[PDB]
Design an enzyme around this catalytic site. Sequence first.
Site, PDB file in Angstrom:
ATOM      1  N   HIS A   1       4.161  52.618  -0.072  1.00 15.65           N
ATOM      2  CA  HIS A   1       5.439  52.287   0.560  1.00 15.65           C
ATOM      3  C   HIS A   1       5.857  53.384   1.536  1.00 15.65           C
ATOM      4  O   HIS A   1       6.988  53.879   1.512  1.00 15.65           O
ATOM      5  CB  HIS A   1       6.526  52.052  -0.492  1.00 15.65           C
ATOM      6  CG  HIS A   1       6.232  50.924  -1.431  1.00 15.65           C
ATOM      7  ND1 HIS A   1       5.259  49.980  -1.182  1.00 15.65           N
ATOM      8  CD2 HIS A   1       6.783  50.591  -2.621  1.00 15.65           C
ATOM      9  CE1 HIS A   1       5.224  49.113  -2.177  1.00 15.65           C
ATOM     10  NE2 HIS A   1       6.139  49.462  -3.065  1.00 15.65           N
TER      11      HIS A   1
ATOM     12  N   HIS B   1      -0.605  36.824  -2.464  1.00 14.62           N
ATOM     13  CA  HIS B   1       0.363  37.788  -1.972  1.00 14.62           C
ATOM     14  C   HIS B   1      -0.242  38.452  -0.746  1.00 14.62           C
ATOM     15  O   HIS B   1      -1.369  38.952  -0.807  1.00 14.62           O
ATOM     16  CB  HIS B   1       0.687  38.794  -3.080  1.00 14.62           C
ATOM     17  CG  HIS B   1       1.718  39.816  -2.711  1.00 14.62           C
ATOM     18  ND1 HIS B   1       2.844  39.511  -1.979  1.00 14.62           N
ATOM     19  CD2 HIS B   1       1.802  41.137  -3.000  1.00 14.62           C
ATOM     20  CE1 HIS B   1       3.572  40.602  -1.822  1.00 14.62           C
ATOM     21  NE2 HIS B   1       2.961  41.603  -2.431  1.00 14.62           N
TER      22      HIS B   1
ATOM     23  N   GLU C   1       0.805  41.064   1.139  1.00 13.48           N
ATOM     24  CA  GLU C   1       1.000  42.475   1.433  1.00 13.48           C
ATOM     25  C   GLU C   1      -0.345  43.114   1.766  1.00 13.48           C
ATOM     26  O   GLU C   1      -1.389  42.738   1.226  1.00 13.48           O
ATOM     27  CB  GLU C   1       1.670  43.185   0.250  1.00 13.48           C
ATOM     28  CG  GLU C   1       2.224  44.571   0.574  1.00 13.48           C
ATOM     29  CD  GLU C   1       3.244  45.052  -0.451  1.00 13.48           C
ATOM     30  OE1 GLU C   1       3.762  44.213  -1.220  1.00 13.48           O
ATOM     31  OE2 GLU C   1       3.530  46.269  -0.491  1.00 13.48           O
TER      32      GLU C   1
ATOM     33  N   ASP D   1      -1.929  45.702   1.069  1.00 12.32           N
ATOM     34  CA  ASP D   1      -2.791  46.300   0.058  1.00 12.32           C
ATOM     35  C   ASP D   1      -3.636  45.266  -0.672  1.00 12.32           C
ATOM     36  O   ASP D   1      -4.534  45.646  -1.433  1.00 12.32           O
ATOM     37  CB  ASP D   1      -1.964  47.122  -0.942  1.00 12.32           C
ATOM     38  CG  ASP D   1      -0.918  46.294  -1.676  1.00 12.32           C
ATOM     39  OD1 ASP D   1      -0.420  45.297  -1.107  1.00 12.32           O
ATOM     40  OD2 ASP D   1      -0.590  46.649  -2.832  1.00 12.32           O
TER      41      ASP D   1
ATOM     42  N   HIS E   1       6.998  40.029  -6.052  1.00 13.83           N
ATOM     43  CA  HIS E   1       8.222  40.631  -5.534  1.00 13.83           C
ATOM     44  C   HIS E   1       8.512  40.243  -4.089  1.00 13.83           C
ATOM     45  O   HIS E   1       9.485  40.723  -3.505  1.00 13.83           O
ATOM     46  CB  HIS E   1       8.136  42.155  -5.627  1.00 13.83           C
ATOM     47  CG  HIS E   1       7.079  42.751  -4.750  1.00 13.83           C
ATOM     48  ND1 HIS E   1       7.373  43.457  -3.603  1.00 13.83           N
ATOM     49  CD2 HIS E   1       5.728  42.734  -4.843  1.00 13.83           C
ATOM     50  CE1 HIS E   1       6.249  43.858  -3.034  1.00 13.83           C
ATOM     51  NE2 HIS E   1       5.236  43.431  -3.766  1.00 13.83           N
TER      52      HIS E   1
ATOM     53  N   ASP F   1       0.531  41.318  -8.239  1.00 17.48           N
ATOM     54  CA  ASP F   1       1.308  42.529  -8.508  1.00 17.48           C
ATOM     55  C   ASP F   1       1.900  42.524  -9.911  1.00 17.48           C
ATOM     56  O   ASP F   1       1.950  43.568 -10.574  1.00 17.48           O
ATOM     57  CB  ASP F   1       2.431  42.683  -7.481  1.00 17.48           C
ATOM     58  CG  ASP F   1       1.968  43.325  -6.191  1.00 17.48           C
ATOM     59  OD1 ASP F   1       0.914  43.996  -6.190  1.00 17.48           O
ATOM     60  OD2 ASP F   1       2.675  43.167  -5.176  1.00 17.48           O
TER      61      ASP F   1
ATOM     62  N   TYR G   1       5.874  51.648 -12.454  1.00 18.44           N
ATOM     63  CA  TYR G   1       5.747  50.546 -11.506  1.00 18.44           C
ATOM     64  C   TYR G   1       6.948  49.607 -11.583  1.00 18.44           C
ATOM     65  O   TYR G   1       7.573  49.298 -10.560  1.00 18.44           O
ATOM     66  CB  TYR G   1       4.446  49.783 -11.767  1.00 18.44           C
ATOM     67  CG  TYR G   1       4.102  48.786 -10.688  1.00 18.44           C
ATOM     68  CD1 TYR G   1       4.637  47.504 -10.702  1.00 18.44           C
ATOM     69  CD2 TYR G   1       3.244  49.127  -9.651  1.00 18.44           C
ATOM     70  CE1 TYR G   1       4.327  46.590  -9.711  1.00 18.44           C
ATOM     71  CE2 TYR G   1       2.928  48.219  -8.655  1.00 18.44           C
ATOM     72  CZ  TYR G   1       3.471  46.953  -8.690  1.00 18.44           C
ATOM     73  OH  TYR G   1       3.157  46.051  -7.702  1.00 18.44           O
TER      74      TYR G   1
ATOM     75  N   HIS H   1      -3.564  45.393  -9.389  1.00 11.20           N
ATOM     76  CA  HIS H   1      -3.590  46.850  -9.475  1.00 11.20           C
ATOM     77  C   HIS H   1      -3.854  47.258 -10.915  1.00 11.20           C
ATOM     78  O   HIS H   1      -3.144  46.818 -11.823  1.00 11.20           O
ATOM     79  CB  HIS H   1      -2.265  47.480  -9.023  1.00 11.20           C
ATOM     80  CG  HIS H   1      -1.915  47.224  -7.590  1.00 11.20           C
ATOM     81  ND1 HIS H   1      -2.520  47.890  -6.547  1.00 11.20           N
ATOM     82  CD2 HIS H   1      -0.999  46.399  -7.028  1.00 11.20           C
ATOM     83  CE1 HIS H   1      -2.001  47.478  -5.403  1.00 11.20           C
ATOM     84  NE2 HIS H   1      -1.076  46.572  -5.667  1.00 11.20           N
TER      85      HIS H   1
HETATM   86  C1  FMN Z   1       8.813  47.333  -1.487  1.00 11.29           C
HETATM   87  C2  FMN Z   1       9.184  46.444  -0.334  1.00 11.29           C
HETATM   88  C3  FMN Z   1      10.464  45.904  -0.255  1.00 11.29           C
HETATM   89  C4  FMN Z   1      10.807  45.082   0.812  1.00 11.29           C
HETATM   90  N1  FMN Z   1      12.078  44.547   0.886  1.00 11.29           N
HETATM   91  C5  FMN Z   1      12.420  43.731   1.945  1.00 11.29           C
HETATM   92  C6  FMN Z   1      13.694  43.184   2.031  1.00 11.29           C
HETATM   93  O1  FMN Z   1      14.530  43.425   1.161  1.00 11.29           O
HETATM   94  N2  FMN Z   1      14.020  42.367   3.097  1.00 11.29           N
HETATM   95  C7  FMN Z   1      13.087  42.091   4.072  1.00 11.29           C
HETATM   96  O2  FMN Z   1      13.385  41.364   5.017  1.00 11.29           O
HETATM   97  N3  FMN Z   1      11.819  42.629   3.990  1.00 11.29           N
HETATM   98  C8  FMN Z   1      11.487  43.446   2.933  1.00 11.29           C
HETATM   99  N4  FMN Z   1      10.221  43.978   2.856  1.00 11.29           N
HETATM  100  C9  FMN Z   1       9.237  43.646   3.930  1.00 11.29           C
HETATM  101  C10 FMN Z   1       9.123  44.762   4.956  1.00 11.29           C
HETATM  102  O3  FMN Z   1      10.361  44.955   5.602  1.00 11.29           O
HETATM  103  C11 FMN Z   1       8.047  44.351   5.949  1.00 11.29           C
HETATM  104  O4  FMN Z   1       6.791  44.493   5.320  1.00 11.29           O
HETATM  105  C12 FMN Z   1       8.092  45.163   7.237  1.00 11.29           C
HETATM  106  O5  FMN Z   1       7.325  44.504   8.219  1.00 11.29           O
HETATM  107  C13 FMN Z   1       7.516  46.552   7.021  1.00 11.29           C
HETATM  108  O6  FMN Z   1       7.855  47.359   8.124  1.00 11.29           O
HETATM  109  P1  FMN Z   1       7.136  48.786   8.324  1.00 11.29           P
HETATM  110  O7  FMN Z   1       5.638  48.627   8.439  1.00 11.29           O
HETATM  111  O8  FMN Z   1       7.661  49.382   9.610  1.00 11.29           O
HETATM  112  O9  FMN Z   1       7.479  49.660   7.138  1.00 11.29           O
HETATM  113  C14 FMN Z   1       9.872  44.795   1.800  1.00 11.29           C
HETATM  114  C15 FMN Z   1       8.592  45.336   1.724  1.00 11.29           C
HETATM  115  C16 FMN Z   1       8.250  46.160   0.659  1.00 11.29           C
HETATM  116  C17 FMN Z   1       6.870  46.743   0.574  1.00 11.29           C
END
Ligand code: FMN
Lengths: 401, 401, 401, 401
Positions: A22, A78, A80, A82, A146, A165, A193, A226
């Site tokens: 993160h 998912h 993400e 990772d 999540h 996750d 976690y 993970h």
């Molecule tokens: C732990 C976590 C929490 C997140 N919470 C939100 C959120 O509350 N609202 C939202 O719109 N996106 C949320 N995201 C998505 C991120 O904002 C999105 O992946 C963004 O493109 C990441 O930008 P960055 O690469 O500049 O950090 C979350 C992502 C992660 C990993």
Amino acid sequence: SIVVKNNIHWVGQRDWEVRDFHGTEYKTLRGSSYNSYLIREEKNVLIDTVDHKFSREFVQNLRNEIDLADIDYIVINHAEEDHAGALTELMAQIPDTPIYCTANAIDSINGHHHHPEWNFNVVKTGDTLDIGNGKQLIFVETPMLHWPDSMMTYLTGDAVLFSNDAFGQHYCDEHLFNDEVDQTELFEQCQRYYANILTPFSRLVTPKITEILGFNLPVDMIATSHGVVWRDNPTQIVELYLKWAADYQEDRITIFYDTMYNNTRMMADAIAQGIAETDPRVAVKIFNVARSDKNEILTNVFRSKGVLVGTSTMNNVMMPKIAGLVEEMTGLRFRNKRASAFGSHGWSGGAVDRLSTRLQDAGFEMSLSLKAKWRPDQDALKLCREHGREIARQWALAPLP
Amino acid sequence: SIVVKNNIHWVGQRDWEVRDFHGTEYKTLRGSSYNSYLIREEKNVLIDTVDHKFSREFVQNLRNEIDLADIDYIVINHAEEDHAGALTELMAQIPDTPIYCTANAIDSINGHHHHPEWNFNVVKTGDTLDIGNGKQLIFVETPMLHWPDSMMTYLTGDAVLFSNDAFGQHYCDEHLFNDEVDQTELFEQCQRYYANILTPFSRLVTPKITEILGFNLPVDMIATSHGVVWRDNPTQIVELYLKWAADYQEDRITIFYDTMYNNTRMMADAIAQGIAETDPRVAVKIFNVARSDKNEILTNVFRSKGVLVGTSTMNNVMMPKIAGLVEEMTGLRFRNKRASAFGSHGWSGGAVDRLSTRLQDAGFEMSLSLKAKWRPDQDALKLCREHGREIARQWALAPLP
Amino acid sequence: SIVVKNNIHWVGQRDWEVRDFHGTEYKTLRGSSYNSYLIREEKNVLIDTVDHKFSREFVQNLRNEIDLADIDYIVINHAEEDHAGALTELMAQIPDTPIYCTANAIDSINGHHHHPEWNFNVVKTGDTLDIGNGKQLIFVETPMLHWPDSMMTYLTGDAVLFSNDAFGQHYCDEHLFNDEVDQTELFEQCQRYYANILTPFSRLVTPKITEILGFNLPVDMIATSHGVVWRDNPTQIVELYLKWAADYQEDRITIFYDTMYNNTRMMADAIAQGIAETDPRVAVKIFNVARSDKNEILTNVFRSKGVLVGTSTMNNVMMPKIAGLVEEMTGLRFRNKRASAFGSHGWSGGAVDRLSTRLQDAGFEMSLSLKAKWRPDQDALKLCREHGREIARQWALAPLP
Amino acid sequence: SIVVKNNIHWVGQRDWEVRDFHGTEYKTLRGSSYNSYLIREEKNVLIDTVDHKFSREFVQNLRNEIDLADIDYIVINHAEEDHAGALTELMAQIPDTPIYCTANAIDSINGHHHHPEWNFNVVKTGDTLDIGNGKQLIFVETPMLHWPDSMMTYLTGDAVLFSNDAFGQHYCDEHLFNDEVDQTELFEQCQRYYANILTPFSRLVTPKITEILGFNLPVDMIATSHGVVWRDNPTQIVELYLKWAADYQEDRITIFYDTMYNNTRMMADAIAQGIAETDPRVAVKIFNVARSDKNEILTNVFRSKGVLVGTSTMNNVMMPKIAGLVEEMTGLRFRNKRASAFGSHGWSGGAVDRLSTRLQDAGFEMSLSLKAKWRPDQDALKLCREHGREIARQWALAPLP
Ligand SMILES: Cc1cc2nc3c(=O)[nH]c(=O)nc-3n(C[C@H](O)[C@H](O)[C@H](O)COP(=O)(O)O)c2cc1C
Ligand SMILES: Cc1cc2nc3c(=O)[nH]c(=O)nc-3n(C[C@H](O)[C@H](O)[C@H](O)COP(=O)(O)O)c2cc1C
Ligand SMILES: Cc1cc2nc3c(=O)[nH]c(=O)nc-3n(C[C@H](O)[C@H](O)[C@H](O)COP(=O)(O)O)c2cc1C
Ligand SMILES: Cc1cc2nc3c(=O)[nH]c(=O)nc-3n(C[C@H](O)[C@H](O)[C@H](O)COP(=O)(O)O)c2cc1C
């Protein structure tokens, strides 16, 4: 690759080195893994991929296990990076292979990879995918657990829940199964976690687990994205999640602060003495936010009935690291916890009041604040000690002895 | 000790090792010094002491220079522990020696040392202390520059202004005088010091400097409490302070952000391109707050006409380090600067709006925000680039070519 | 992209965030850049690529500039991952495009990328590649400046020398040209780069520069692989390299140590005072290796006529950071420098002699060591100052005011 | 203070913040404590003091417990600054109070404090000091456990062994007793302490424990100078020490390395896979020295039957962090362990052989080294797995399922 059971093969990637998740907001002090699975029945199914940093290794290792053209379906629980980070490199080789994912995952997969032409198959809870030999995949939508795109995939017969996750943890080991690793390290990483990632979604944890159990599907293993595969008493991590989700708290108080000349630190120590001598049932941890592991502070807050937060006044505002930590707590949405602000000031103070308001904004039920001028003398430290006594009495889970 | 001039001797302490000031909020990458001076005329006067960590060495070194009982007066310009930290150990040896300080310094000295029985002499601006041989000390109250207790002491004849923190800098060198050190390193540390410490008090800097100059006292040297003694064109640092205090800004834009998957970083880079290609007069610096020196970011903000701040959304709030940095900027009180918030989000966003409001709270005049979903594709990056163009046009100090 | 000159377009990647190079053995405190160039004559020539971390960005940006199929030749001056890291991704699109490089570069390119089927063309110094419009590339082998595979490419007519690492520096800025950036910052990164990277190859710098100069080829610009393009007085960096390569040293002594209870630190300070009061012409820097930027220590060592290294004895050996730093100096092969070891011990000592021996192994001409037991009292500190005095007299570059 | 037993009062200092010990060579991730004890029989005896950082606090707190003039004897088991650091401040108030310590402690106390006029009483093993009420202190010399000056003090009747560093651990908690703290956390800090501090003195641990046991003295509590007081089954820590001292090792292999482009890291992972699939009984840990807690690496080395250390070649030598860590292992004198060096190189190599030699110098029984050029392709990685397989077979503790 490693045999998980029967025709399920682990084709993921261990990450002993990784420390920053993160960005730098989750320190993985015991590394992590990225679990990807290859099921070889009548059809061949790949479950998730791995972090983008190992995309090349992932696709090459996969070739060692199977001719890529022989992969029938790809499941993305998912998107993400990772877990879906290697998808672009994989799809460059087999671009016609269908992808099974949630509706929201189309948005998240496309958002990262920019390949909308891929062959997406939207799945909803209860949809099935037959893979032959009497086995099938059952999909379970888990939105905001999540991410909006999150889902789980269940494999009948083998009774394996590919939970991604959920129920995972950042823990790296050459052995695959929960009964094969150090249990202390395993639990510590599991709780770290949940506390740092899943706390704000706890209200969604219980209903979804209830719903899944209502499907009456047997579970032999839980194969997360993970860490270990749960095979021995696998639902133990599910029960933990049920406990952790219910606004979890122990008879525990966490004190953390930042300080420039140790005055606020002296207050924190006197508060802790007053607590420990008034209620011996309370476990107390003290952290200097500038000299401590932030994710450990937050795990302790997660475990505590309440917290005391300390800051000196610097330019009428609070210490920046305290402001940052309070901002993060505001997003984690701790529930049923109490808090009290304290700190030292040179003249007009104000930072403690500022901090108390923001701790209230973060959802803590506030007790009175504690303020001291410059370095506390013996009289001031008595006041700090009595503050600990008063807090200990206020926050007692039961009558004190 | 080192001869400053005539009977003024430097009896301070160099600190090559130190890196953490104000807790960890001021990184002293070039060390620092703690300047203490011993004037030996008909009377012997000690000006300030040193940080508490060198108290033992300070009192022993002082014995090497003079019989402690021969010290007539002690002057405390400022009771912060880095200058009065050694006072308790000194006063244990010569407890009857009078201390000359501001009224507020009695509160701050007592607040740290807990020895109210010491023999304090409150001084106000214009009070004098004769030390023989036709020389005298003149005291100048400088409240909130940077503490309520702050003052300066002027020595007639020798024409030395013992300014304590004012005009100093955290810079360590075996040589004492400004003309004896590397000028680039010296200026860099001077500006870093003003930007990170004195910016919120800039409205008090000019009137006090005006007042002091109105005394028509000649100045041969300015002997600060940190860093070099100004002896060659000594008022050069005074003129810098006059410029730095007038809501200083260059044609410069600072961009800083935190990011979890580099999406907000991609936006920051596209913004910077749009700026550089629209207004070539603007110097642009980009910092990742998690991977950069925070005090350097703030020096650049101090030097900039405006800033763009980037954050992804994490649990509906902003990245904690961004919240912390914005809290600190709120206390530094930058003036006449503009700002714009940006960042990437996964679904519902909100952090960028949150950040824009708090940048406004910190005193920045806000331009429109820039938001992008997930990883920006070529179309999204064009929007980010045009944002840089629009900002560059809005913030141009003069018509663009 | 940016126009370098005529039909030469910069198509590289700026890296504002990078901090860790050579693992973590080179901190890039002002970021860096990976310069790639696209020449568009009758033939289209790509010179180097970028770091692997931006291969996806690099290929897409390159697409925005030209249809990849229209790229005729690819020149790889140097196959380190920060320049050839995007080669695999690029070659997946245009696998038939010939690569021009040194014979050693075939082994290094294949070593990283594992694609020996690529179309390699070995070049030797003096070989030419015509690109039309009367212009041609001329190749110059520079083995061990700084890799076996290293070479430079010269473009006649435009008179641009593509030097890859040579004459470059880790310095990120939105502006491309040397006359557009801050000069002290530019110089600082240039010297930091030579000292920490090219020092051990200094014996190869002068002959190679002489050879190239012998070609009587005009040089309007030096286009490196890191940092600015040298267009304003481009020979200035070539002259610096000639100076830095001649066993460079200023009248400067660097003192660095590691300490557990500051006893060795007290010795370092007393040594420095003995130096400064014996020869005022000597610049002195002191660093605690455990709390300093290692690359800055080495830059000072490079600038210094001699060093003093301090360690306490821990388990009969030296402190590990000193061992590690001495190991690194052994590989940099500093020449014509002197050294003296010192430190504190509790009983048996031995670490100082061990250190002195290894400083000799690293190439330093050794002066007597200095030892003290536990904390130096006033008598021991005098010996330390006298050691400093004796070192200054021994190492004086001139007869001593 | 806290009542330890009867008239024994804890008057030490908890240190929640401390992170850096031995300079920075021992990270105290759970803080520490400096245990001092005040015994109040007919005579009043103070056992040790606290770290110098809290001398002012220590004396004032001690005043709150007793009039300093009523202190009859001061016992210094060990003169390291974390226990005798407050001695100068205390002796300034009661300079006539006798100090009981080993002959070596006179040299170490004077070495730090410079007050030889203090009233020292040399004690040898078996010497006694009556404190009234039928009770007496009995002194036991423990030179090189872990300092020449080290000793233990035994209090008859109460049957409390004040062991100073021995059997202690860096672990901060508001509760004093071993049965009141988290056990895994307690054990972790105990083993971390022995491994990183006492390993080289293991040959002295068994004979000394045997000697003490031979005295047939009851032990109700072991009161150390760091961490908990052992009151519940106090012999448990004594048995651990007997085990840890017998060249302790589990069926465990630790792999650590440093890498610049992850080539050596790829080798480490392949080696580990070869081990895990050849002997599943072996616990394997892998650490990148540049991104890991060094004290955790050493704790694992202590627990391991053998290690593999990896380094690339940089300027013909090994990477400095590996050199430094190997230097430190040379001083810890691990016994009955095996080792094998590996790493990647670009051309000449040599760093692996250099490393293997120094691993032998540090005491490891050496197996063949493993080398690879640039990035290992699939064929090279097989050799790496086979190396792991060969190591597991060689180092098998039992015949291999
Ligand atoms: C732990 C976590 C929490 C997140 N919470 C939100 C959120 O509350 N609202 C939202 O719109 N996106 C949320 N995201 C998505 C991120 O904002 C999105 O992946 C963004 O493109 C990441 O930008 P960055 O690469 O500049 O950090 C979350 C992502 C992660 C990993
Ligand atoms: C840079 C700086 C800024 C300060 N600003 C304020 C302030 O705005 N208001 C105030 O009451 N005290 C201010 N102080 C005084 C501190 O709050 C005071 O020294 C306090 O006792 C320090 O607490 P600590 O040792 O826990 O950090 C400031 C001190 C420093 C060094
Ligand atoms: C963990 C440890 C190990 C030590 N090992 C030795 C040793 O082997 N030989 C010796 O003479 N002193 C040894 N000492 C004592 C130190 O060298 C002594 O305290 C010295 O004055 C510290 O110097 P410093 O403050 O510069 O680190 C050791 C000290 C510690 C803390
Ligand atoms: C600054 C530097 C110096 C190097 N010096 C040598 C050397 O002296 N001998 C050699 O064979 N390779 C040398 N190399 C090449 C590396 O050993 C080679 O790239 C290796 O594959 C990197 O391994 P790693 O990724 O595990 O760090 C050097 C590389 C760099 C970047």
